# Entry
Amino acid sequence: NEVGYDDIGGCRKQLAQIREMVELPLRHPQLFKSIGIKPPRGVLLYGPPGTGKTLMARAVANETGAFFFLINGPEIMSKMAGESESNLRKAFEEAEKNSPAIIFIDEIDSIAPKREKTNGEVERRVVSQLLTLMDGMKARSNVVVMAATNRPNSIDPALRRFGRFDREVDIGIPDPTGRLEILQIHTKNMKLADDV
Amino acid sequence: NEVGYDDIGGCRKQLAQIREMVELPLRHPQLFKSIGIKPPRGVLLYGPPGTGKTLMARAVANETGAFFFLINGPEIMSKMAGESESNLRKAFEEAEKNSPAIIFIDEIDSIAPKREKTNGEVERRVVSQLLTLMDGMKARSNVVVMAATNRPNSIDPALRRFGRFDREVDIGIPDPTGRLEILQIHTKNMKLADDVDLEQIAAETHGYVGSDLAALCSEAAMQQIREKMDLIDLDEDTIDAEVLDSLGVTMDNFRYALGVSNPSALREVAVVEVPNVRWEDIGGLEQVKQELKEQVQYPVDHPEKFLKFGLSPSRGVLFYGPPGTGKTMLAKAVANECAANFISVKGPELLSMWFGESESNIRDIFDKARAAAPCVVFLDELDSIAKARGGSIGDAGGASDRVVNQLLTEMDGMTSKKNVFVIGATNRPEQLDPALCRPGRLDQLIYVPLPDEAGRLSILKAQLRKTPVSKDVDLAYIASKTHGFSGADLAFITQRAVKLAIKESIAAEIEPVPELTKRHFEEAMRDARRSVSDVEIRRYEAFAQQMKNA
Amino acid sequence: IKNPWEVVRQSPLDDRLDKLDGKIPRKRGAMCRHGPKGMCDYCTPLDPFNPQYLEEKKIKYMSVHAYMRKINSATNRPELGSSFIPPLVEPYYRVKRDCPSGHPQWPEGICTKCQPSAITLQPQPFRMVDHVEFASPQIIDRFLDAWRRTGVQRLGILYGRYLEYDAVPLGIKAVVEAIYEPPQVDEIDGITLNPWENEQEVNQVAKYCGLEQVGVIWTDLLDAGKGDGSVVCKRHADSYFLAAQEIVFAARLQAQHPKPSKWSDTGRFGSNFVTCVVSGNEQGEISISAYQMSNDAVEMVRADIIEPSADPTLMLVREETRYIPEVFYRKINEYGANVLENAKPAFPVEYLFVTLTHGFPDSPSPLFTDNIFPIENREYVGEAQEVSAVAKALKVHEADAPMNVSDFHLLCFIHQMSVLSKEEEALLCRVATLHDLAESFQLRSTTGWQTLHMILQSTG
Ligand SMILES: Nc1ncnc2c1ncn2[C@@H]1O[C@H](COP(=O)(O)OP(=O)(O)OP(O)(O)=S)[C@@H](O)[C@H]1O
Ligand SMILES: Nc1ncnc2c1ncn2[C@@H]1O[C@H](COP(=O)(O)OP(=O)(O)OP(O)(O)=S)[C@@H](O)[C@H]1O
Ligand SMILES: Nc1ncnc2c1ncn2[C@@H]1O[C@H](COP(=O)(O)OP(=O)(O)OP(O)(O)=S)[C@@H](O)[C@H]1O
Ligand SMILES: [Mg+2]
Ligand SMILES: [Mg+2]
Ligand SMILES: [Mg+2]
Ligand SMILES: [Zn+2]
Ligand SMILES: [Zn+2]
# Structure
């Protein structure tokens, strides 16, 4: 139930990106400090549904020595009014406390639809809570925000603008080579016959 | 009020699924533990309304030794804000406490509509409460979530994604065999008379759900009481027991109850149903009979030669010809031969469900046929799709509209490995676009000619199989005189001749002749009239000579 | 015939309170866009019901008149007479009697047109009385002599009058003058009454004196065992404030004392009758907590709905003649939301009272200046009512000595002696409350007070 790099397979090029984007600033923030650039804090995952997007989060997160915090989309939207936006403020204070930190948010579109295409102001607050708290972060915090969705278009694009989410990372459909690897992941726990 | 397996009947294949999905992980979680796979916790029921979907829940639930936790749809939605989402949290903690657990949720769409198509955030919270709490479960909990609906499309699809609900289980309309069993369930509590033939009833009932049949049983009971109302005085506080002992429901009460408002079933959807017509009931055209025996029966019977030969077949068959040539019955008889499932879809059925915009159902036609593979999908009245824009001449709009553009996607969105088959039939084949006639989509084109006099003989043999005809009837002398007359025309003559016979039958009764005389015929033979012009045939014969020029 | 508010008659205080708007006039505020005889959005006169004004002045609820002038327009006013709508509605949580829908009475018949509504126990947005001016500490210091000698609790009855309390806008103050106590069997944590026997008699003294039964007082004085007067801090935030048996029992007496009103549908609204609990503070000194049941809390006792629990903070809802629908209470959670929780089967007792301030005058000048009488119903401590004290109390064998009747306990004892007739005792309670010299000289020349002399010049 605790995911390493070996537990995911096939999307090697995508994992090559995220290790440059997440593993790299955390175990070596000095590199961006030596080169004098800002670490990207706007890692965004997207793709088709059911493509390991939640799986690749912990595949990176458990392979750091960094603190991790987890946010589910509908879990915040399940909460009452005001209290739901409290948990986001409770999220980032813990991450800015434990400064090597990973914040993954699964199903980001549920807490962030388009503000043009929405009805409840409670939805509009929690978007506005999110847009505020993304900008309240610091580069000295060394805290990485991850977010995943299956509908990259339903999001309010103000997140996808600069400073908040810049790293659009798509998880494509794997080739028959990579999905062969995925079968080997699930069947190595299974008990098979030799004809397989 | 407590339901066993015997209390439900007919849908045996569906119950075979659920026992593999629910009974199997609970009484033996070791099997998935020994094989090392995850037990599916995403059992979803769906079907038409009133089809025992609530009934089959307790039919499984009471037949476990597991804990059960009932959860209704409108009961949560009846509750106030916040408190409604509390009960869901109050639900799963008890189930994860009593770890062999069954959670059935009736009418899941009421607590889970589409989040795109909803207004209240309270609805959006309780969906978000549900999506959260489904994922909060564990495999060590060994807790199974059941959910039922009558509208599988109105649900937020995030539930129907992986990890939450994977086991789409449809409860179809039962056959006359299975609905016979359903009648025996309701009538074994009832007190009947000896004339009652449920098998005669179950033959005469074709598109009923069990709720319709239970209402059918309840209706004929009342007419039995209506016959006793003369012997029953309502001012009395208690009627005597002698009329209670004589209170036995007759067969004719069901004959009354078959012609009542009960009959109005729920048949106005995209249905799958095994047919009843066979090859003997369609006279003539044995060439294109064998062509269907070639083209569609060989894949459904033997895919082994294809992988031997490395070639996927043509999955697209188009019927065409003049109108009234029995093209509707052709796909039914071949699905009745190789026992494949059958889906009849007519032209305006696409359109009338798209004035209400049922196009996921159009995808679900292919999905349910994929769910009911082997299945053939029959598209009746393809001219009506052209007649949605009038024709190919039409209102200057051709056959192509939103229907075609949907179908060309869904026809191309079919795996060639699947034995799911698509059968098209029109009578105006020039008036259809070649984009639908494209290879890969519909490349087999089958002309349906008029029969000859031998075919017209074989039809009149086949049409009169259930009619008490006279003995002097020279059908060949009829077949000699009937030349340009279609197979529809021949049945039309018999409808005239039977009407001519009833113009002798109940005429004689008001002035049993169960014979269809030559005098009944030679009147209709003199009154016989051709429905198809030969110059129309010379079009189709030129298409039968060559339509591949398009 | 007429309305009740066309035949009922207000108190003179309610006559005094009607002719005022109670408006708080601002001068030229911040965003004045005007000359000094113009106005802006920020230099209007203020409201008696103004919440920002009540918040800055730390005032909990508005007065019932400030409630009255809030909920009603100024045109809708009983000097119209016939065309008047009473804005106040006395609650009717019993059962729609004489139901006009064909079904029987409530009993044997019910429909929608006869059922009452489910109760939303919000906090009551107003109160009747704001300040409880105890007119003298010697009123209390006499009254607490039973507890210092015994240690068990004490119940009384607030007597006095209602005057303008000008510190809060439209404030009515329960000016407290006097206490009489019925026969009762006293215990420690609760008190059960004996029936009160001279019910018309002591009320006649208040009718003489110009007082009335304005409320109830009792004590929750449990000495904390260190010998100073400190209490177990038991009526505070963490414990509770009102015992729920006290709530029902006071609402029994409060239903026995409503107030007639020309602004309510029955011609009566609310209650002049108030409630006080003598206790101790955190600082260990003898304190007082004054309350009153809400108009729902009176009605749910009148309609027999709520019930005390073992937990004093929890109030039970009675299970099933009657009709018990939902009860709610609006909350404020940790993010300000209003959640009506199901009050069945139990709920906090917070939503039933109103808070009142309490104190003293700057200098004690009550209608009573004398303290010479041993209190009734205390024969268990040997403190009884006998005729022999009047030789020293009114000083009648010392026949020169002036009139010491300025003592309601003694005035009821003089009324227990019942010697002076209805005009001469109202000439006594004239002089017992106003103390006029020529009218004392009239009363010392009246026959019946000289009869009260010459009878008590011959006792022992
Ligand atoms: N590429 C993959 N490699 C390995 N396992 C996979 C892969 N894609 C899906 N899975 C499995 O399927 C599950 C689906 O979870 P996710 O794909 O991460 O959910 P998702 O991708 O965020 O899409 P959702 O949850 O429907 S929005 C994973 O937890 C894995 O168990
Ligand atoms: N296939 C069936 N076999 C036996 N009894 C049935 C069948 N279908 C319906 N009934 C009876 O009719 C009732 C209808 O209830 P259900 O079909 O279980 O409700 P539903 O299918 O969830 O559809 P709803 O309630 O209208 S959304 C059942 O409780 C049975 O009494
Ligand atoms: N060769 C035939 N053999 C048996 N029945 C036939 C034959 N030709 C027509 N019929 C009857 O004609 C009727 C209509 O059949 P269909 O297939 O609907 O005709 P069609 O060729 O599809 O043209 P339309 O517009 O639908 S009537 C049915 O009652 C058939 O039984
Ligand atoms: Mg996911
Ligand atoms: Mg149901
Ligand atoms: Mg047809
Ligand atoms: Zn101004
Ligand atoms: Zn009524």
Q: What stands out?
A: The CA atoms of residues 372 and 441 of chain B lie 21 Å apart. The beta strands of chain B are 42-46, 67-72, 101-106, 143-149, 167-170, 316-320, 341-345, 375-379, 421-425, 444-447. Chain B touches chain C through four residues (CB under 8 Å).
